[PDB]
Coordinates of C-alpha atoms and ligand atoms in Angstrom, one line a residue:
Chain A
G7 CA 0.0 0.0 0.0
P8 CA 1.0 3.7 0.4
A9 CA 4.5 3.7 2.0
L10 CA 7.2 5.9 3.3
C11 CA 11.0 5.7 3.3
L12 CA 12.7 7.2 6.3
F13 CA 16.5 7.8 6.0
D14 CA 19.2 8.5 8.4
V15 CA 21.3 11.3 6.9
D16 CA 25.0 11.1 7.8
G17 CA 26.6 7.9 6.5
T18 CA 23.4 6.8 4.8
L19 CA 22.5 9.5 2.3
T20 CA 26.0 11.2 2.6
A21 CA 29.5 10.1 3.1
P22 CA 30.3 10.6 6.9
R23 CA 30.5 14.4 7.6
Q24 CA 29.9 15.4 3.9
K25 CA 27.3 17.0 1.8
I26 CA 25.1 14.7 -0.2
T27 CA 26.3 14.3 -3.8
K28 CA 24.2 15.7 -6.6
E29 CA 24.0 12.2 -8.0
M30 CA 22.4 10.9 -4.8
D31 CA 20.3 14.0 -4.5
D32 CA 18.9 13.3 -8.0
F33 CA 18.3 9.6 -7.2
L34 CA 16.2 10.4 -4.2
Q35 CA 14.1 12.9 -6.1
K36 CA 13.4 10.2 -8.7
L37 CA 12.6 7.7 -5.9
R38 CA 10.1 10.3 -4.4
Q39 CA 7.9 10.1 -7.6
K40 CA 7.1 6.5 -6.5
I41 CA 7.1 6.8 -2.7
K42 CA 7.2 9.5 0.0
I43 CA 10.6 10.1 1.6
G44 CA 11.8 11.5 4.9
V45 CA 15.1 12.1 6.7
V46 CA 15.9 11.9 10.4
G47 CA 19.1 13.0 12.1
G48 CA 20.4 13.9 15.5
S49 CA 21.9 17.2 14.3
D50 CA 20.0 20.5 14.2
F51 CA 18.1 21.9 11.3
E52 CA 21.0 24.1 10.1
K53 CA 23.3 21.0 9.9
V54 CA 20.6 19.1 8.0
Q55 CA 20.3 22.0 5.6
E56 CA 24.1 22.1 5.1
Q57 CA 24.2 18.4 4.3
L58 CA 21.0 18.1 2.1
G59 CA 20.3 21.7 1.0
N60 CA 18.7 24.9 2.2
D61 CA 15.4 23.8 0.5
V62 CA 15.3 20.5 2.4
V63 CA 11.8 20.9 3.7
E64 CA 10.6 21.2 0.1
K65 CA 12.6 18.2 -1.2
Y66 CA 11.6 15.7 1.4
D67 CA 8.1 15.0 2.6
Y68 CA 9.3 14.7 6.2
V69 CA 12.4 16.3 7.8
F70 CA 13.2 15.3 11.4
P71 CA 16.3 17.2 12.8
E72 CA 17.1 16.5 16.4
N73 CA 15.7 13.0 16.1
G74 CA 12.3 14.6 15.3
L75 CA 12.1 17.1 18.3
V76 CA 11.8 19.5 15.4
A77 CA 9.6 18.0 12.7
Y78 CA 8.5 19.2 9.2
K79 CA 5.8 17.6 7.2
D80 CA 4.9 18.9 3.7
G81 CA 7.1 21.9 4.4
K82 CA 5.5 23.0 7.7
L83 CA 6.5 22.6 11.3
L84 CA 4.6 20.1 13.4
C85 CA 3.7 20.4 17.1
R86 CA 6.6 20.5 19.4
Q87 CA 7.8 19.2 22.8
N88 CA 10.8 20.1 25.0
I89 CA 12.6 18.3 27.8
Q90 CA 11.4 20.6 30.5
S91 CA 7.8 20.3 29.6
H92 CA 8.0 16.5 29.4
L93 CA 10.1 15.9 32.5
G94 CA 8.8 18.7 34.7
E95 CA 10.9 21.5 36.2
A96 CA 11.6 19.6 39.4
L97 CA 13.3 16.6 37.7
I98 CA 15.2 19.0 35.3
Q99 CA 16.6 20.9 38.3
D100 CA 17.5 17.8 40.3
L101 CA 19.4 16.5 37.2
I102 CA 21.2 19.8 36.8
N103 CA 21.9 20.2 40.5
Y104 CA 23.4 16.8 40.6
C105 CA 25.5 17.2 37.5
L106 CA 26.8 20.6 38.7
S107 CA 27.9 19.3 42.1
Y108 CA 29.5 16.2 40.5
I109 CA 31.5 18.3 38.0
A110 CA 32.7 20.6 40.9
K111 CA 34.4 17.5 42.3
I112 CA 36.1 16.2 39.1
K113 CA 39.9 17.0 39.0
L114 CA 40.8 18.1 35.5
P115 CA 43.7 19.9 33.9
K116 CA 41.3 22.6 32.7
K117 CA 37.7 23.7 33.2
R118 CA 36.0 26.4 31.1
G119 CA 32.3 27.2 30.5
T120 CA 29.0 25.7 29.3
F121 CA 29.1 22.6 31.4
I122 CA 25.4 22.1 30.8
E123 CA 24.0 22.9 27.4
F124 CA 20.2 22.9 27.5
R125 CA 18.7 21.6 24.2
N126 CA 15.2 20.9 22.9
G127 CA 15.5 17.1 23.4
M128 CA 18.4 16.7 25.8
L129 CA 20.8 18.1 28.3
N130 CA 24.4 17.9 27.0
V131 CA 26.8 17.7 29.9
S132 CA 30.6 18.3 29.6
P133 CA 33.0 18.0 32.5
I134 CA 35.5 20.4 30.9
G135 CA 32.9 22.8 29.4
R136 CA 31.7 23.1 25.7
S137 CA 33.4 26.4 25.3
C138 CA 36.9 24.8 25.5
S139 CA 39.3 25.3 22.7
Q140 CA 40.2 22.6 20.2
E141 CA 43.5 21.9 22.0
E142 CA 41.7 21.6 25.3
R143 CA 39.0 19.3 23.8
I144 CA 41.7 16.9 22.6
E145 CA 43.5 17.0 26.0
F146 CA 40.3 16.2 27.7
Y147 CA 39.3 13.4 25.3
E148 CA 42.7 11.8 25.9
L149 CA 42.6 12.1 29.6
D150 CA 39.0 10.7 29.6
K151 CA 40.2 7.5 27.8
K152 CA 42.8 7.1 30.5
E153 CA 40.7 7.9 33.6
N154 CA 37.1 6.9 32.5
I155 CA 35.7 10.2 33.6
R156 CA 32.6 10.3 31.4
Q157 CA 32.0 6.6 31.9
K158 CA 32.1 6.9 35.7
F159 CA 29.9 10.0 35.6
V160 CA 27.3 8.3 33.5
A161 CA 27.4 5.1 35.5
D162 CA 26.8 7.2 38.6
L163 CA 24.0 9.2 37.0
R164 CA 22.3 5.9 35.9
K165 CA 22.1 4.6 39.5
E166 CA 21.2 8.1 41.0
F167 CA 18.3 8.6 38.5
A168 CA 17.2 5.0 38.3
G169 CA 13.5 4.8 37.4
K170 CA 13.1 8.5 36.4
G171 CA 12.7 7.7 32.7
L172 CA 16.1 9.0 31.5
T173 CA 18.7 7.6 29.1
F174 CA 22.3 8.6 29.2
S175 CA 24.7 8.2 26.2
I176 CA 28.3 9.2 25.8
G177 CA 29.2 10.5 22.3
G178 CA 31.9 12.6 20.8
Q179 CA 34.9 13.8 22.8
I180 CA 33.9 16.1 25.7
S181 CA 30.3 15.3 26.6
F182 CA 27.4 13.0 27.2
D183 CA 23.7 13.4 26.5
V184 CA 20.8 13.0 29.0
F185 CA 17.5 12.6 27.3
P186 CA 14.0 11.1 28.0
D187 CA 13.6 7.5 27.4
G188 CA 12.6 7.0 23.7
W189 CA 13.8 10.5 22.5
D190 CA 16.3 8.8 20.2
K191 CA 15.4 8.5 16.5
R192 CA 12.2 6.6 17.4
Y193 CA 10.8 10.0 18.5
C194 CA 9.9 10.9 14.9
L195 CA 7.7 7.9 14.5
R196 CA 5.0 9.7 16.4
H197 CA 4.6 11.9 13.4
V198 CA 4.2 9.2 10.8
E199 CA 2.6 6.2 12.7
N200 CA -1.0 5.3 12.0
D201 CA -1.1 8.0 9.2
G202 CA -2.0 5.7 6.3
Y203 CA 1.3 4.1 5.5
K204 CA 1.1 0.3 5.1
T205 CA 4.9 0.2 5.5
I206 CA 7.5 2.6 6.9
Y207 CA 10.9 1.6 5.7
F208 CA 14.0 2.8 7.5
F209 CA 17.6 2.9 6.3
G210 CA 20.6 3.6 8.6
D211 CA 24.3 2.9 8.8
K212 CA 24.6 2.5 12.6
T213 CA 21.9 -0.1 13.4
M214 CA 24.1 -2.2 15.6
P215 CA 23.7 -2.2 19.4
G216 CA 25.0 1.1 20.6
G217 CA 24.5 2.8 17.3
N218 CA 22.3 5.8 16.8
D219 CA 20.0 3.9 14.4
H220 CA 19.6 0.8 16.5
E221 CA 16.3 1.7 18.3
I222 CA 14.4 3.0 15.3
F223 CA 15.6 0.0 13.3
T224 CA 14.5 -2.5 15.9
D225 CA 11.2 -0.8 16.5
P226 CA 8.3 -2.9 15.1
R227 CA 6.8 0.2 13.4
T228 CA 9.6 0.2 10.8
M229 CA 10.8 -2.3 8.1
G230 CA 14.4 -1.7 8.9
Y231 CA 17.4 -2.0 6.6
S232 CA 21.1 -1.7 7.6
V233 CA 23.2 0.0 5.0
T234 CA 27.0 0.0 4.9
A235 CA 27.4 3.1 2.8
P236 CA 25.3 5.5 0.6
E237 CA 26.0 3.3 -2.4
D238 CA 24.5 0.3 -0.5
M239 CA 21.5 2.4 0.4
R240 CA 20.9 3.2 -3.3
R241 CA 21.4 -0.5 -4.1
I242 CA 18.6 -1.5 -1.7
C243 CA 16.3 1.2 -2.9
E244 CA 16.7 0.2 -6.6
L245 CA 15.9 -3.4 -5.5
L246 CA 12.8 -2.6 -3.5
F247 CA 11.3 0.2 -5.5
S248 CA 12.4 -0.4 -9.1
Chain B
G7 CA 53.9 67.0 23.4
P8 CA 52.8 64.3 21.1
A9 CA 49.3 63.0 21.8
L10 CA 47.0 60.0 21.3
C11 CA 43.2 59.9 20.9
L12 CA 41.6 56.8 22.2
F13 CA 37.9 56.1 21.2
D14 CA 35.3 53.8 22.5
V15 CA 33.7 52.2 19.5
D16 CA 30.0 51.5 19.9
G17 CA 28.1 54.8 20.4
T18 CA 31.2 56.9 20.0
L19 CA 32.6 56.1 16.5
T20 CA 29.3 54.4 15.4
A21 CA 25.6 54.8 16.1
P22 CA 24.6 52.3 18.8
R23 CA 24.6 48.7 17.3
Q24 CA 25.7 50.0 13.9
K25 CA 28.7 49.8 11.7
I26 CA 31.1 52.7 11.1
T27 CA 30.1 54.9 8.2
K28 CA 32.4 55.5 5.2
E29 CA 32.3 59.2 6.1
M30 CA 33.4 58.7 9.7
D31 CA 36.0 56.2 8.6
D32 CA 37.4 58.9 6.2
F33 CA 37.3 61.5 9.0
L34 CA 39.4 59.3 11.3
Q35 CA 42.0 58.7 8.6
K36 CA 42.3 62.5 8.1
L37 CA 42.5 63.0 11.9
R38 CA 45.2 60.3 12.0
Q39 CA 47.4 62.6 9.8
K40 CA 47.6 65.0 12.8
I41 CA 47.5 62.6 15.9
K42 CA 47.8 58.9 16.6
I43 CA 44.5 57.2 17.1
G44 CA 43.3 54.0 18.9
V45 CA 40.0 52.2 19.5
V46 CA 39.1 50.2 22.6
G47 CA 35.9 48.1 22.9
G48 CA 34.5 45.3 25.1
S49 CA 33.9 43.0 22.2
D50 CA 36.2 40.4 20.6
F51 CA 38.3 41.0 17.5
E52 CA 35.7 39.4 15.2
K53 CA 33.0 41.8 16.4
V54 CA 35.3 44.8 16.2
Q55 CA 36.0 43.7 12.6
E56 CA 32.2 43.8 12.0
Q57 CA 31.9 47.3 13.5
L58 CA 34.9 48.9 11.9
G59 CA 36.0 46.8 8.9
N60 CA 38.0 43.6 8.5
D61 CA 41.1 45.8 7.9
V62 CA 40.7 47.5 11.2
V63 CA 44.3 46.9 12.4
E64 CA 45.5 48.8 9.3
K65 CA 43.3 51.9 9.9
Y66 CA 44.2 52.6 13.6
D67 CA 47.6 52.9 15.4
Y68 CA 46.2 50.8 18.2
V69 CA 43.2 48.4 18.2
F70 CA 42.1 47.1 21.7
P71 CA 39.3 44.4 21.4
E72 CA 38.2 43.0 24.8
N73 CA 39.3 46.1 26.6
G74 CA 42.9 45.7 25.5
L75 CA 43.3 42.0 26.5
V76 CA 43.9 41.7 22.8
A77 CA 46.2 44.5 21.7
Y78 CA 47.3 45.5 18.1
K79 CA 49.9 48.2 17.5
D80 CA 50.9 49.4 14.0
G81 CA 49.1 46.5 12.4
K82 CA 50.7 43.7 14.4
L83 CA 49.7 41.9 17.6
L84 CA 51.3 43.6 20.5
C85 CA 49.9 41.4 23.2
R86 CA 47.2 38.8 24.1
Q87 CA 46.0 38.1 27.6
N88 CA 43.2 36.1 29.1
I89 CA 41.8 35.2 32.5
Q90 CA 43.1 31.6 32.5
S91 CA 46.6 32.6 31.7
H92 CA 46.6 35.4 34.3
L93 CA 44.9 33.6 37.1
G94 CA 46.3 30.2 36.4
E95 CA 44.3 27.0 35.9
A96 CA 44.2 26.0 39.5
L97 CA 42.6 29.3 40.6
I98 CA 40.3 29.2 37.6
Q99 CA 39.1 25.8 38.6
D100 CA 38.7 26.7 42.3
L101 CA 36.5 29.6 41.3
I102 CA 34.4 27.5 38.8
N103 CA 34.1 24.6 41.3
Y104 CA 32.8 27.0 44.0
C105 CA 30.3 28.5 41.7
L106 CA 29.0 25.2 40.4
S107 CA 28.5 23.8 43.9
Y108 CA 26.9 27.0 45.0
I109 CA 24.5 27.1 42.1
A110 CA 23.6 23.5 42.7
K111 CA 22.1 24.7 46.1
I112 CA 20.1 27.6 44.9
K113 CA 16.4 27.0 44.9
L114 CA 14.8 28.5 41.9
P115 CA 11.6 27.9 39.9
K116 CA 13.7 27.1 36.8
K117 CA 17.3 26.2 35.8
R118 CA 18.5 25.9 32.3
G119 CA 22.0 25.9 30.8
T120 CA 25.2 28.0 30.5
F121 CA 25.5 28.7 34.2
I122 CA 29.1 29.7 33.6
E123 CA 30.0 31.5 30.4
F124 CA 33.8 31.5 30.0
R125 CA 35.1 34.6 28.3
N126 CA 38.7 35.7 27.8
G127 CA 38.3 38.6 30.2
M128 CA 35.7 37.4 32.7
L129 CA 33.5 34.6 33.9
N130 CA 29.8 35.4 33.5
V131 CA 27.9 33.5 36.2
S132 CA 24.1 33.0 36.2
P133 CA 22.2 31.0 38.8
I134 CA 19.4 30.4 36.3
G135 CA 21.6 29.9 33.2
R136 CA 22.2 32.3 30.4
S137 CA 20.3 30.1 27.9
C138 CA 17.0 30.9 29.6
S139 CA 14.3 32.8 27.7
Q140 CA 13.5 36.5 28.1
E141 CA 10.3 35.6 29.9
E142 CA 12.4 33.4 32.3
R143 CA 14.9 36.2 32.7
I144 CA 12.1 38.5 34.0
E145 CA 10.8 35.9 36.3
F146 CA 14.2 35.3 37.8
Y147 CA 14.9 39.0 38.3
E148 CA 11.7 39.4 40.2
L149 CA 12.7 36.6 42.6
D150 CA 16.2 38.1 42.8
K151 CA 14.9 41.5 43.9
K152 CA 13.1 39.9 46.8
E153 CA 15.5 37.1 47.7
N154 CA 18.7 38.9 46.9
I155 CA 20.0 35.7 45.2
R156 CA 22.8 37.3 43.2
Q157 CA 23.8 39.7 46.1
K158 CA 24.3 36.9 48.6
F159 CA 26.2 34.8 45.9
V160 CA 28.5 37.6 45.1
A161 CA 29.0 38.4 48.8
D162 CA 30.1 34.8 49.5
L163 CA 32.4 34.8 46.5
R164 CA 34.0 38.1 47.7
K165 CA 34.8 36.5 51.0
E166 CA 36.3 33.4 49.5
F167 CA 38.4 34.8 46.6
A168 CA 38.7 38.6 46.3
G169 CA 42.2 38.3 48.0
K170 CA 43.2 36.7 44.7
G171 CA 42.7 40.0 43.0
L172 CA 39.2 39.6 41.7
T173 CA 36.3 41.9 41.2
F174 CA 32.6 40.9 41.1
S175 CA 30.0 43.1 39.4
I176 CA 26.3 42.4 39.3
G177 CA 24.5 43.7 36.2
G178 CA 21.3 43.1 34.2
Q179 CA 18.7 40.6 35.2
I180 CA 20.3 37.2 35.7
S181 CA 24.1 37.2 36.0
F182 CA 27.3 38.7 37.5
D183 CA 30.8 39.0 36.1
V184 CA 34.0 37.8 37.8
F185 CA 37.2 39.4 36.5
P186 CA 40.7 40.3 37.6
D187 CA 41.0 43.7 39.3
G188 CA 41.3 46.5 36.6
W189 CA 40.2 44.4 33.6
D190 CA 37.8 47.1 32.4
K191 CA 38.7 49.5 29.6
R192 CA 41.5 50.9 31.7
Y193 CA 43.4 47.6 31.0
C194 CA 44.4 49.0 27.6
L195 CA 46.3 52.0 29.1
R196 CA 49.3 49.7 29.9
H197 CA 49.9 49.4 26.2
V198 CA 50.1 53.1 25.4
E199 CA 51.5 54.7 28.6
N200 CA 55.1 53.8 27.6
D201 CA 55.0 55.3 24.1
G202 CA 55.8 58.9 25.0
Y203 CA 52.4 60.6 24.8
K204 CA 52.0 63.9 26.7
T205 CA 48.2 63.7 26.5
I206 CA 46.0 60.7 26.0
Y207 CA 42.5 61.8 25.0
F208 CA 39.6 59.5 25.6
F209 CA 36.1 59.8 24.0
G210 CA 33.2 57.6 25.3
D211 CA 29.5 57.7 25.5
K212 CA 29.0 55.8 28.8
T213 CA 31.2 57.7 31.1
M214 CA 29.0 57.8 34.2
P215 CA 29.2 55.3 37.0
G216 CA 27.9 51.9 35.8
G217 CA 28.9 52.7 32.2
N218 CA 31.6 50.8 30.5
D219 CA 33.7 54.0 29.9
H220 CA 33.5 55.3 33.4
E221 CA 36.8 53.8 34.8
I222 CA 38.9 54.8 31.8
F223 CA 37.3 58.2 31.7
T224 CA 38.1 58.8 35.4
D225 CA 41.6 57.4 35.2
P226 CA 44.2 60.2 35.8
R227 CA 46.2 59.1 32.7
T228 CA 43.4 60.2 30.3
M229 CA 41.9 63.5 29.2
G230 CA 38.4 62.4 29.1
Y231 CA 35.5 63.8 27.0
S232 CA 32.0 62.5 27.4
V233 CA 30.1 62.4 24.1
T234 CA 26.4 61.9 23.5
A235 CA 26.8 60.6 19.9
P236 CA 29.3 60.3 17.0
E237 CA 28.3 63.8 15.8
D238 CA 29.1 65.2 19.2
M239 CA 32.5 63.5 19.2
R240 CA 33.2 65.1 15.8
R241 CA 32.1 68.6 17.0
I242 CA 34.6 68.3 19.9
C243 CA 37.4 67.1 17.7
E244 CA 36.9 70.1 15.4
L245 CA 37.4 72.5 18.4
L246 CA 40.3 70.5 19.8
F247 CA 42.3 69.7 16.6
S248 CA 40.8 71.9 13.9
Ligands
G16_301 O1 32.2 16.0 20.5 P1 31.1 16.6 21.4 O2 31.4 16.1 22.8 O3 31.0 18.0 21.3 O4 29.6 15.9 21.1 C1 28.9 16.2 20.0 O5 29.0 15.0 19.1 C2 28.4 13.8 19.7 C3 28.3 12.7 18.8 O6 29.5 12.5 18.1 P2 29.8 11.1 17.4 O7 28.7 10.7 16.5 O8 31.1 11.2 16.5 O9 30.1 10.0 18.4 C4 27.0 14.1 20.4 O10 26.7 13.0 21.2 C5 26.9 15.4 21.1 O11 25.5 15.6 21.4 C6 27.5 16.5 20.4 O12 27.4 17.7 21.2
CL302 CL1 27.3 25.8 32.5
MG303 MG1 24.3 7.6 10.2
MG304 MG1 11.8 -2.2 12.7
MG305 MG1 30.1 53.1 23.7
MG306 MG1 40.8 60.7 33.0
NA307 NA1 23.8 24.8 15.0
NA308 NA1 15.9 2.9 30.6
NA309 NA1 52.7 50.0 32.3

């Protein structure tokens, strides 16, 4: 029946960290004549626009930056949630208060600023501070491997906030993310489920346990496909839809 | 003897929140044929470039972004300074640690992110977090006026650290600044007081207490002139230098 293809962006439609190629851009627009298409990424709208184009909300039937915490359908923004409204101010403050006190007790070479970055769909927590310089970021990343600073911090937060409906995830070099359970890429499915699609396909390059496509891939609402590269994505689409 | 004119940038060489005009820029290059000129501002070099032109270091004999913590003379970097280098990483971290722990204990209706904004010349500290919305800023300031949150916080910091040569200044609705003693616009006077000037003129538009030109205006090493607008600065320069 009527169906939808949901694509991870980075590593799936694009080489890691790159803009999409015009060839792949043309392929997806031809695919879209047979089936609706949508993209989902953890990065913010501006990054999605850089990777896929400023006119992204016109070229894709759905656009889900920030895992869908910002969501466009048919070019218009859908209803929105944020972490503080979902969790309540009291839990937000307890989480922040705890993280602030914990960071105060970490011994580091350097500390700077923006220890807590408050985003739509998460708190990003950095022991050094997100305002650090590139040199300081690498110094921290290197010490963190040696001392397990972020790993211990997250293990402590998981016990302290057991039962409160939070997920913690270390990514990148200086930080970890604290977000409501289920606000990974599965969040966007709320905007497409039970909306007439007989099948919702999903394509992603990090569907393994621990990868950022694992939960949406394994969700029963999607017919999930693991891709190894954008050329593998195109291969599967030509098989299924041509 | 030989003299130097030092100008505030915003509101003195430019209309507030506006770029320098071509006509003013021409005026200063003519004035520079008669007397050395310099600019000092609170903003970083990139912002000074936005206000005065990317070639700013070529158009003035001295350029002092960040109150002189960055100093250019005759087109080349004379000196760079920042709070972490001056205070040392140990003291930086003790200050930040104390503020993080303290903020973790403040009871507020809301907390957000960027409790500590690290700048080259100061730490900007906010119990609620600088990322909060304008509505949240107003709510906080109402509570602060009745609970004296920022006053008690600064009082306790003054007891604990000010012997380390630190100043604390409350301002606006949600934050206070922590900075080494004398790191206001006066800081830049160290870079010109050795170059043989008999008079250092200073022109600024916020020369009253509280304003960011007040300390440099009042410093005995400057011949200070308060100006209401760029046109007023120009009228005064006409009478002084023809
Ligand atoms: O590098 P950071 O700490 O600024 O972290 C940045 O990138 C990470 C992912 O990076 P990757 O996919 O390469 O693991 C994200 O988890 C994080 O939210 C973001 O702020
Ligand atoms: Cl912070
Ligand atoms: Mg990917
Ligand atoms: Mg599935
Ligand atoms: Mg001014
Ligand atoms: Mg004076
Ligand atoms: Na961005
Ligand atoms: Na869980
Ligand atoms: Na000196």
